[PDB]
Each structure stands twice: as structure tokens, then as C-alpha cells.
Design a protein around this ligand. Structure first.
Ligand SMILES: O[C@@H]1[C@@H](O)[C@@H](O)OC[C@H]1O
Ligand SMILES: O[C@@H]1[C@@H](O)[C@@H](O)OC[C@H]1O
Ligand SMILES: O[C@@H]1[C@@H](O)[C@@H](O)OC[C@H]1O
Ligand SMILES: [Mg+2]
Ligand SMILES: [Mg+2]
Length: 354
């Protein structure tokens, strides 16, 4: 029986000379045992959902800030840095953004002139969203995920840009506007990031590398790359993770691990263990070796890595479970963190605290 998380050495303190230790949270996890764990181990947090587009302006003009404000407040009262997730994404983004003045999907428009009109209108709506949000939180956010997942997993176009509604309507323009509007209302000292997953593997990694390089050349304000790091136990490799970070550091950009979780499974996550108790210790031990190597690496690169955030706190709450269920007929459980469902340290914790 391992001790509780609040009884062991603080992760944030152990790495205070290298980078922040953060966690993704939901408004209802800011008290109780979770709140206790957060204050004890982390010096940074991010909203798992409360700050995505659809969560802040579900209707044009109609803003909902409660969840987001609660998270911003918690971080203020506990002196923790705060990453903002996220100003632009193709998921959890309200539909009104993409309808034309007549209420029809902009993607259905065929008149070249009217399309050019809708493009300008969308960029204007994006501009307003960013402006309203950045003004309200500019003094609390310490890192902004200006855009999320704008690079494709394959190569649908020479540039490898995800062809979401944002792209179909504005090409890469929405990306430029987002960063420039963010820099405009957040101040020249706000840290602006482009966030994505699988930033360690080619071709995606190279597409992203070319995009930032191209945007940098055009004066687009981009300060760093956010690596979600939704990785596995044996993939990607340490070398691939290292190479990617070294590559972006080479462009003079900061790196941050934003949504770290180490799944016990490959991809898709099959077969997944049905319950937590059904997971064999060998798995956790393998996960522990992975974590040791991972943080040893992050420590080796702490000169170009400023923050490391887990996409959750303890194994009782993780989006990886949804993924596990989808691929295992509705039943499955993952365990990606260093703290188990009961907030008791795991083999992994010891391996990254020493
Ligand atoms: O990690 C996985 C990711 O979630 C994406 O959806 O598919 C590629 C792989
Ligand atoms: O595309 C990825 C696949 O190649 C695998 O290895 O890891 C998860 C996926 O997201
Ligand atoms: O982990 C999150 C939780 O709030 C649940 O509802 O599933 C959705 C996820 O975003
Ligand atoms: Mg650092
Ligand atoms: Mg170690």
C-alpha cells in the first residue's frame, strides 16, 4: 500500500530549476483531495475543457465564463502559472462561427466573391473571440495555445495543413490572424504557442516545422511549440522526442509538454483491461521505466523546455478511458499518471522524483 500523493515529495519543487509541473483540470476538481494534490505537487494548471471555443462563446455574443473564471481564480489564489487552452481548434468550437449571413454553411458557398466575403467574416469573428477572451485573461495566462491541431496527420496538401472548416474557408489565414490578434491584445511579452500531437514523428513533425518556419519568415508572432505528448510506453522513442524539441529550439522557439499521458496500450488501445484492478503490475513497472527515461530526457533538455503538463491529475479521471472504451466494446480502463485512482503514488512517481 503506497502513501498518498500529498505525503510524498512535491513534483513542482523537485523540478523547479527545470520547468513547471502542471495539470489539466475541470472546475469541479478544485477542492477535496484533487485540490489538495494540485496545491502540493503542481505550479501550473490548464483547463481541460472550460476554455475551448464552444465553452466560452456557445452563441455569438453570449459568453459563459464561470467554469473558466473558477479555474483562473484557483490558479491566482494558489500562485500557479496558467496555460490557456485554446483559442483555435476544429473540435468543441461552436457552429455559428461557420454559417454565412444567410445562415448557411460557408463551405457550401460556390460564388468566389461571396466566399471571399465569408472568409473575411470568419476571420472577423475569430478576431472578436480572441480579443474578448485575451482581454479578460491577459494578466493571468502565462502561456497561450493560440491554435490547436492545425497540422494534418497525413499529406492532403503539400503543406500538410489539416483541412478543417477553418482551412477550407481561410486557408492558413486563420492561423496568422489568431497569432497576430493574440499578440495584439496580450502584449509583446505573452507567450504564444502552436499546439499539436505526434509532433515527434514524420511527416507531421516536418510539416509543423515548415509551417512555423514559413510563418516566422512572414513576421507571424509565434513563441513556442506545444507538444501534447499523448504517447505510449514504447512510442514515440526518446530520440524522436529529443530530435523534435531540438529542432524547434533551433528555430529559437520554446518547447512545452502540454497534455502528457502515458497510456498502457498502443493504438488503437486494444485490448484494454476491463477494470483498474485487472491491470498487472508488470504494466505499471513498464510505465515506470518509461517515465524515468522521459523525465531524464526533459531534464536533459530543460534549457529549451519551460513547462510539462499532464492531461489530468490521477488515474481516476482521464480521457484515455473514453478512447479505451470506444475500441473495446464500451469497457476499458487506462492508467496514465503517477497517481492511482485513490491518489496513492505509483511505481512511476518514485522513478521521476529521485
Ligand atoms: O494518438 C492518436 C490520436 O488521438 C489521433 O486521433 O489518431 C492518431 C493517434
Ligand atoms: O498516428 C499514431 C500511430 O502511428 C501510433 O503509433 O501512435 C498513435 C497514433 O496517434
Ligand atoms: O475527461 C473529461 C470529463 O469531463 C468527461 O465528461 O468526459 C469528457 C472529458 O473531456
Ligand atoms: Mg526551462
Ligand atoms: Mg528518475
Amino acid at each position: 500500500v503506497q502513501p498518498f500523493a500529498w505525503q510524498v515529495a512535491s513534483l513542482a519543487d523537485r523540478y523547479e530549476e527545470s520547468f513547471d509541473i502542471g495539470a489539466a483540470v475541470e472546475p469541479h476538481q478544485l477542492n477535496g483531495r484533487q485540490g489538495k494534490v494540485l496545491k502540493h505537487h503542481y505550479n501550473s494548471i490548464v483547463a481541460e475543457n472550460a476554455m475551448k471555443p464552444i465553452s466560452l462563446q456557445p452563441e455569438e455574443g453570449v459568453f459563459t465564463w464561470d467554469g473558466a473564471d473558477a479555474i483562473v481564480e484557483f490558479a491566482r489564489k494558489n500562485n500557479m502559472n496558467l496555460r490557456f487552452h485554446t483559442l483555435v481548434w476544429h473540435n468543441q468550437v461552436p457552429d455559428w462561427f461557420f454559417l454565412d449571413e444567410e445562415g448557411n454553411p460557408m463551405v457550401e458557398e460556390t460564388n468566389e466573391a461571396k466566399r471571399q466575403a465569408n472568409k473575411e467574416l470568419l476571420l472577423e469573428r475569430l478576431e472578436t473571440h480572441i480579443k474578448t477572451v485575451v482581454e479578460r485573461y491577459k494578466d493571468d495566462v502565462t502561456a497561450w495555445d493560440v491554435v490547436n491541431e492545425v497540422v494534418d496527420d497525413g499529406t492532403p496538401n503539400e503543406r500538410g495543413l489539416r483541412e478543417s472548416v477553418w482551412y477550407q474557408i481561410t486557408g492558413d489565414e486563420y492561423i496568422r490572424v489568431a497569432f497576430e490578434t493574440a499578440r495584439k491584445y496580450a502584449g509583446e511579452d505573452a507567450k504564444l504557442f502552436i499546439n499539436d500531437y505526434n509532433t515527434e514523428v514524420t511527416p507531421k513533425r516536418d510539416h509543423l516545422y515548415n509551417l512555423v518556419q514559413d510563418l516566422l519568415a512572414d513576421g507571424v508572432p509565434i513563441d513556442g511549440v506545444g507538444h501534447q505528448a499523448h504517447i505510449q510506453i514504447d512510442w514515440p522513442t526518446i530520440d524522436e522526442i529529443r530530435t523534435s524539441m531540438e529542432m524547434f529550439a533551433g528555430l529559437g522557439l520554446d518547447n512545452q509538454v502540454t497534455e502528457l499521458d502515458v497510456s498502457l496500450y498502443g493504438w488503437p488501445p486494444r485490448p484494454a483491461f476491463p477494470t483498474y484492478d485487472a491491470i498487472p503490475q508488470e504494466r505499471f513497472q513498464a510505465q515506470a521505466d518509461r517515465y524515468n527515461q522521459l523525465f531524464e530526457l526533459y531534464e536533459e533538455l530543460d534549457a529549451d523546455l519551460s513547462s510539462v503538463t499532464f492531461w489530468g491529475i490521477a488515474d481516476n479521471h482521464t480521457w484515455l478511458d473514453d478512447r479505451a472504451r470506444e475500441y473495446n466494446d464500451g469497457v476499458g480502463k487506462d492508467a496514465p499518471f503517477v497517481f492511482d485512482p485513490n491518489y496513492r503514488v505509483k511505481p512511476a512517481f518514485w522513478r521521476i522524483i529521485d
